[PDB]
Amino acid sequence: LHKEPATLIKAIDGDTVKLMYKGQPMTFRLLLVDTPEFNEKYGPEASAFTKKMVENAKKIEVEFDKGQRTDKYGRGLAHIYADGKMVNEALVRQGLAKVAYVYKGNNTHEQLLRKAEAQAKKEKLNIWS
Ligand SMILES: Cc1cn([C@H]2C[C@H](OP(=O)(O)O)[C@@H](COP(=O)(O)O)O2)c(=O)[nH]c1=O
Ligand SMILES: [Ca+2]
Secondary structure, eight states: OOOOOEEEEEOOOSSSEEEEETEEEEEEEEETTEETTTTTTTHHHHEEEEEEHHHOOOOEEEEESSOSOTTTTTTTTEEEEEETEEEHHHHTTTTEEEEEOOOOTOTTTTTHHHHHHHHHHHOGGGGOO
């Protein structure tokens, strides 16, 4: 896999963000995770967490996996990095997302994220509390 540039347009929620990619506005849905909706328990904390991570970043990068790059809603499917740190993994590590939506072919970082989830669960963080 490889990282490509993007710039923030707007934070949306825990697991979606609007980025300019190849000079076009796109909504990205983070691979391999599920954050609670804003109206759900931990939804606001997830949203805030992703917001801070992407807004404070000097450098946003997107990393597509080997499979489909857009979902059925037209959302980009990617790993998103903020100054080198993967948002997807950071959410899981903090107990603010569950590993989820692991589809064959877009699962390169699955075991990395599962490892993070195990550690969040051990620590009884957030969702796992
Ligand atoms: C993360 C992800 C979601 N989706 C689709 C599956 C779900 O369809 P349904 O809308 O039919 O439930 C939806 C979940 O996204 P949200 O968690 O953002 O709602 O997004 C994919 O198709 N591929 C993916 O990799
Ligand atoms: Ca969600």
